[PDB]
């Protein structure tokens, strides 16, 4: 539970958080449900914090009759929608609910139908990134970001990546089926070791610049 | 406090049965149990950006830009709060924010004895009102007397004028209501019209409910409010940002919807 | 704070270690008391 | 390059500290006792 | 003209207004004239607010003599842009000049060679977008924007769209000859009905995200 | 409090790395995250019953028979408390009360390099103490005071004489 | 920057000794006491080395 | 801020003290290794100052394969070299002398002769007032080919000014710190606020190179 | 003040130098404190 070790320095940040302050754009949204997704919706995800969500309709209108009150411009988003909405973030906004009875158990998963802060762009955002292949990869300053969609076919998703998992590729190497976040750049440089479908090593968290 | 994520209300049930008295006889005991209900809290925000020349040229037509935008921010947050209070906020997606027409503990909407007030005569409307009062008396097990209790009749705005339906002798529904139930208060709301759909025809809504119950009749140490709009704050100045040739003002409000703590004191009719 | 319970805690600690460490900590506590004596006057 | 975090990443605030509990409790009522309203009361014993 | 029906709420905004706050870039410019465009003007529009103006030279250097004086860094723009200068906005900065027989009629037009600020970057800008095709189209979050140029051939502009009119075109259904606004995205989700060449159908006011 | 069930302790890991200063460079930002550990509470009970004749008869021999029972209750509760603090209470059954020896957030119980001290010589005991101290310093990244000031070596009572 | 107290191990004791109650009967009386303890908590596992089998 | 304050944590205060601690880590690493001295930025540390004696190799090679006599010989040769360089500028019992070690080799001071005398006991009976410290940053200073070379630095702490007339202060080493922690400023927004802090440091300066003996690869 | 600061400083130095050196330096600082006590009176 507490520090079982001592490193020479603190980590630069936790996934979903902001390291650098600058021009940023973020929007609120409701988490919806992959079950409510009308189409097959293959990719499955637990609303993890460092995931890139997609727009899936609006919930502005309130009521059940013809006269409906548009109370707010509310966005209704899903974890792996093709229409990229924003990378979920700012975990301090939310309330910890625990996991399976233990109310104080660690949890980075937002419950379904909750409200999240989806950064559309940020000077620096800590994101969990993954490997798009089974081989070792090196990400540098000039590296791009693409997130797994909801309808990624089983043949393309051989590694069994999560629903909204941001991958991180090199120019002209986007793993197949993956959709790209425009103008997204890997700022800090890291190395991901070789992985398999069963292992699926969690790629080390990275500072990224979006738009 | 605009900050908390949930609101919790507790209900206590006592239990105890008396026995015939005797010395040296075993003492009968009593006990209690408690249950809890929780609702979530929704925060809305609204702001306004004002430039310098924008104000300068708005003042030419004798209009204050910043005042109008601040008033519109307040009114938009009020619309948000009222819509949440009447319909909840994403109650169907798992959020536990419910409204005056959406509370799960509320009794189901019932078809009135008269099919609709558009065609029903004075006898029909007063019969519907009397049957609702009958249901209210039965549900409370004769603990709430509607003759001397403050009771609210919430109506759709499209059917309140039907309280003016008269007989050939000049007896309106209003005379019968205000003479039979002098403490009854009639309120009309636009949100109560077209609450649900039957077949391409909006159904209007009538809600009978007791405003307050005395602490004597129930023993509650709560306040006795059947319905409560749990509003954290109607208006907070989140902050201001003075920049060189413009400034931004940002406000917010919070609301947890509506909570019905006494479902037994509510009667609902749909489709008058 | 109380300045006595901490002194007995340090006494217990010093008696629990080895001889050189015990004599070092005891003379350090003696120095602290002497410094506080100087501070009082 | 990122140092491995010691604590597992988690949402900071437990829900229990973000709840407001309404004052008082709602007592469950029973049927009314109206024998005194019908035939009054008398103390003879 | 006067409210003929009471609604349950207010509109989110008006075209040309800023509905969101954040990073934004706008530059001043002069409206110039459409009658000065070298290749004539195959498309024509009345310098309306929610229109994308493009660069047409600089007017910084003052004086006709041999020693010039660069009083200020000024640029002149034309509604039919070829290089996108900016989407005109902020209609509270201007005055209601006239409408050729009605000085107080509601107009969004700017007189020729007048002042204006044109948005390169905007957190959210309420505009009107036209339909580039005769059929109905549902524009959602993951959709792009493109503006008509004045040099658009009349064969390409069958619907007779105005000069600087903005258009939503899904992602791979760009009408021929249209000029895309790079990294421009459609935030609010609306649906435009089928339209013909004569009636068109002014697109509903809608939020878009620019650069 | 006595009428409680659990005690919660919070561990907050902070985060942040500096950058070189610049007037127009983007500002790096620090942050933190928090985890919590819960431990249940065990209540021990002990009492005493004293009679009048017992009081008089015991007070005849200058013994209270009520103060000695009171302090025996105190000593019994102290034995209960010490046993709880050393071994925990019913941790095998899932009580979530761990002691000094069976805490879940402790490093795995290692084996000494010299095997048992009973068969070991002086060099083996020295090697065991040295390896323990070296492992502690390596784990702690040299957060040990001079001369191992605030370091406690707790031993089995049957092996301390081997020092 | 820890504000917990800085200790590695902490024995959580709610109360060493409380008098729960006294009951006075005819020819005798009972007195009952209690105590509470939550075991021991290791807040800094990095500062521990354990050997078994010495 | 409100959510964090609900659990008795001041988010602003913990973030600000984390900023202070991060700047402290930056300052300590600059003081130990310098900042970008390989690129020619001219701020060196305790381990890579240009005016330091050449990093020597110990007589006994590595301490891992060495016995008690080898470690004793290394310490003796370091002290003798320091005394010869300083021309007997050492106080009685080596008082103002600090022996900095790699953190992975301080436990080798507990290595004994097979008859029960430690290296620490030898230092106690030989140089009783010699300060002994061990630093994490002094381990793995260099590379032989792949083996992290561990270092030993023996140096005089301070030199009295009466003998030479120095107005400097007498310290051999000095970590030049402009400021531990300054508040650059606060930028207050509508629904949040940013606070920026900074610190300055010029590494470590060695003003008396003669009072230093360094061993590499112990 | 400055005197107390210097005392605390020399104390932390006299805690990292063997046992005989530590005990000698602590006794010397103790004697300095007693000399100051004599000087005050």
C-beta neighbour count of B231 within 10 angstroms? 17
What are the C-alpha distances in Å from B68 to residues A30, B55, B79, G6? 31, 11, 16, 56
CA distance B190 to A67: 9
- The phi and psi torsions of E179 (rounded to 5 degrees) equal -105, 120
Which residues in chain I are immediately followed by a break of C to N over 2.5 Å? none
Q: Which chains touch I (3 or more CB pairs under 8 A)?
A: C, F, H
Per-residue tokens: B45 = 């925000």
Chain centroid, CA E171 distance in Å: 20
Q: What is the DSSP letter of B105?
A: T
Who's near D30: CB < 8 A, 6+ residues apart? B141
- Nearest Cβ partner for D28 among B11, B38, B217: B11
CA distance F130 to F108: 18
What would you measure as the largest C-alpha separation in chain C, in angstroms?
35
- CA-wise closest residue to A11 among A19, A23, A2: A19
Q: What is the CA radius of gyration of chain B?
A: 25
What is the total residue count of chain H? Answer: 218
Do chains H and A touch, with touching meaning 3 or more CB–CB pairs less than 8 Å apart? yes
C-beta neighbour count of D26 within 10 angstroms? 24
Helix/strand/coil (H, E, C) string of A83-115?
Answer: CEEEEEECHHHCEECCECCECCCCCCECCCCCE
- Put simply, whether A72 touches B (Cβ < 8 Å) is yes
Per-residue tokens: G44 = 């800094």
Helix/strand/coil (H, E, C) string of chain A?
Answer: CCCCCCCCCCCCCCCCCECEECCCEEEEEECCCCCCCCCCCCCCCCCECCCEEEEEEECCEECCCCCCEECCCCEEEECCCCCEEEEEECHHHCEECCECCECCCCCCECCCCCEEEEEEEEEEEEECECCCCCCCEEECCCCEEEECCCCCCCCCCCCCCCCCCECCECCCCCCCCCEEEEEEEECCCEEECCCCCCCCCCCCCEEEEEC
> I4: number of CA atoms within 13 Å, CB side?
9
Q: What is the DSSP letter of F65?
A: S
- The phi and psi torsions of A65 (rounded to 5 degrees) equal -105, -165
User: What experiment produced this structure?
Assistant: cryo-EM
To which residue do tokens 């008795």 refer? H8
CB F105 within 8 A of CB G42: yes
For A108, name the nearest residue in chain F, comparing CA atoms only.
F33
What would you measure as the largest C-alpha separation in chain B, in angstroms?
94
Who's near F52: CB < 8 A, 6+ residues apart? G27, G28
Q: Which chains touch H (3 or more CB pairs under 8 A)?
A: A, B, D, F, G, I
- CA-wise closest residue to E51 among E119, E111, E104, E144: E119
Pairing of strands D13-14, A95-96: parallel
CA distance C25 to I22: 10
Element (H, E) at F19: none
Orientation angle between helical segments I20-40 and C19-40, nearest 10 degrees: 20
- Nearest-CA distance F90 → chain H (Å): 30
For F8, name the nearest residue in chain A, comparing CA atoms only.
A104
- The phi and psi torsions of C13 (rounded to 5 degrees) equal -55, -50
CB B197 within 8 A of CB A65: yes
Q: Which chains touch F (3 or more CB pairs under 8 A)?
A: A, D, G, H, I
CA distance F152 to F145: 12
DSSP C1-41: --SSHHHHHHHHHHHHS-HHHHHHHHHHHHHHHHHHHHHH-
- Put simply, whether B56 touches A (Cβ < 8 Å) is no
For D6, name the nearest residue in chain F, comparing CA atoms only.
F13
To which residue do tokens 């507490």 refer? A2
Question: What's the reported resolution, in angstroms, to a tenth?
Answer: 2.9
What are the C-alpha distances in Å from I32 to residues C41, F2, I4? 16, 52, 12
C-beta neighbour count of B168 within 10 angstroms? 6
CB G47 within 8 A of CB F136: yes
CA distance A166 to A156: 15
Q: Write out chain B residues lying below 8 Å of H191, CB-based.
A: 45, 238-239, 250
First to last CA, chain E: 36
First to last CA, chain B: 40
> A-E interface: how many C-beta pairs under 8 angstroms?
36
- The phi and psi torsions of A73 (rounded to 5 degrees) equal -80, 90
To which residue do tokens 């090593």 refer? A201
- Put simply, whether D20 touches A (Cβ < 8 Å) is no
Q: What is the DSSP letter of H125?
A: H
CA distance B225 to B211: 6
Three-state SS for B131?
A: helix
What are the C-alpha distances in Å from B221 to residues A146, B11, B12, D24, D28? 58, 10, 10, 5, 12
CB A58 within 8 A of CB E141: no
- The phi and psi torsions of A182 (rounded to 5 degrees) equal -65, 140
Three-state SS for F139?
A: helix
Q: What is the DSSP letter of E69?
A: E
- CA-wise closest residue to H3 among B256, F32, B229: F32
To which residue do tokens 């970590």 refer? H175
Alpha helices (H) along B21-152 = 52-58, 65-87, 122-139
CB B10 within 8 A of CB D21: yes
CA distance F34 to F11: 6
CA distance A13 to F16: 6
By CB atoms closer than 10 A (0-12, 13-18, 19+), residue A178 is buried
For I13, name the nearest residue in chain F, comparing CA atoms only.
F146
C-beta neighbour count of B4 within 10 angstroms? 22
- The phi and psi torsions of H192 (rounded to 5 degrees) equal -160, 175
CA distance F78 to G35: 9
As beta bridge partners, residue F8 has: F38
DSSP F20-31: ---SSSPEE--E
As beta bridge partners, residue A186 has: A208
Q: What is the DSSP letter of F144?
A: P
- Nearest Cβ partner for E92 among B47, B58, B248: B58
Chain centroid, CA I11 distance in Å: 6
- The phi and psi torsions of B44 (rounded to 5 degrees) equal -115, 150
What are the C-alpha distances in Å from C2 to residues A203, C25, E119, G13, H35? 53, 19, 68, 22, 47
- Nearest Cβ partner for B218 among D15, D18, D27: D27
Per-residue tokens: H50 = 């240009």
C-beta neighbour count of F5 within 10 angstroms? 9
Three-state SS for E20?
A: strand
Chain centroid, CA A28 distance in Å: 14
What would you measure as the largest C-alpha separation in chain H, in angstroms?
74
- CA-wise closest residue to G39 among E191, B122, H3, F102: F102
Surface of G (5-34) touching A: CB under 8 A: none
Per-residue tokens: A204 = 């080390």
Per-residue tokens: B160 = 């309140």
Element (H, E) at H80: helix H68-86
């Amino acid at each position: 539970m507490f520090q079982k070790q001592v490193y020479r320095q603190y980590t630069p940040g936790f996934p979903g958080d902001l390291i650098e302050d600058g021009p940023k754009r973020a929007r609120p949204g409701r988490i919806m449900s992959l079950s409510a997704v009308n189409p097959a919706a293959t990719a499955t995800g637990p609303n993890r914090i460092s995931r890139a969500f997609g727009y899936a309709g609006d919930v502005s209108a309130l009521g059940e009759g013809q006269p409906k009150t548009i109370a707010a411009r509310a966005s209704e988003v899903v974890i792996g929608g093709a229409n990229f909405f924003g990378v979920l973030g700012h975990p301090k906004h939310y309330a910890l609910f625990g996991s399976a009875g233990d109310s104080l158990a660690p949890s980075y998963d937002l419950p379904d139908g909750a409200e999240g802060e989806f950064f559309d762009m940020a000077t620096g955002l800590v994101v969990e990134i993954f490997n798009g292949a089974a081989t070792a990869l090196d990400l540098d300053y000039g590296d791009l970001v693409a997130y797994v969609p909801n309808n990624l076919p089983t043949a393309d998703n051989a590694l069994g990546l999560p629903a909204g998992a941001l991958v991180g590729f090199k120019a002209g190497s986007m793993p197949t089926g993956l959709v790209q976040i425009p103008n997204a750049r890997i700022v800090n440089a890291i190395s991901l070791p070789a992985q398999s479908a069963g292992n699926l090593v969690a790629g080390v968290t990275i500072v990224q610049l979006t738009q | 406090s605009w900050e908390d994520q949930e609101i919790v209300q507790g209900i206590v049930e006592p239990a105890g049965t008396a026995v015939e008295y005797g010395d040296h006889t075993n003492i009968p005991l009593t006990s209690w149990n408690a249950n809890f209900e929780r609702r979530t809290i929704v925060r809305g925000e609204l702001g306004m950006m004002v430039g310098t020349l924008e104000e300068g040229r708005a003042s030419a037509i004798r209009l204050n830009s910043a005042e109008t935008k601040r008033q519109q921010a307040a009114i938009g947050l009020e619309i948000f709060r009222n819509a949440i209070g009447f319909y909840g906020w994403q109650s169907g997606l798992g959020n536990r924010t419910y409204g005056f027409l959406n509370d799960p503990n509320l009794p189901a909407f019932q078809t009135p004895p008269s099919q609709g007030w558009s065609t029903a005569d004075w006898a029909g409307i007063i019969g519907d009102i009397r049957e609702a009062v009958r249901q209210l008396r039965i549900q409370s097990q004769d603990q709430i007397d509607p003759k001397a209790e403050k009771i609210t009749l919430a109506l759709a705005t499209s059917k309140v004028d039907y309280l003016s339906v008269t007989t050939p002798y000049g007896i309106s529904v209003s005379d019968w209501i205000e003479q039979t139930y002098p403490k009854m208060r009639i309120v009309s709301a636009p949100e109560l019209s077209g609450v649900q759909m039957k077949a391409q025809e909006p159904e209007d809504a009538l809600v009978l409910f007791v405003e307050d119950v005395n602490a004597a009749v129930d023993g509650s140490t709560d306040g006795g409010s059947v319905f409560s709009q749990l509003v954290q704050s109607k208006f907070i100045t989140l902050g201001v940002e003075k920049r060189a040739k413009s400034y931004v003002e940002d406000f917010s409000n919070g609301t947890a919807g509506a909570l019905c703590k006494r479902p037994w004191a509510v009667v609902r009719y749909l489709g008058i | 704070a109380v300045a006595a319970a901490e002194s007995e805690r340090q006494e217990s600690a010093a008696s629990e270690m080895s001889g050189e460490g015990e004599v070092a900590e005891l003379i350090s506590q003696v120095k602290a008391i002497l410094a506080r004596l100087e501070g009082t006057a | 390059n990122f140092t491995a975090p010691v604590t597992t990443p988690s949402i900071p605030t437990p829900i229990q500290f973000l709840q407001t509990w309404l004052p008082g409790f709602v007592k469950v009522m029973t049927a009314a006792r109206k024998i005194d309203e019908i035939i009054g009361i008398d103390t003879v014993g």
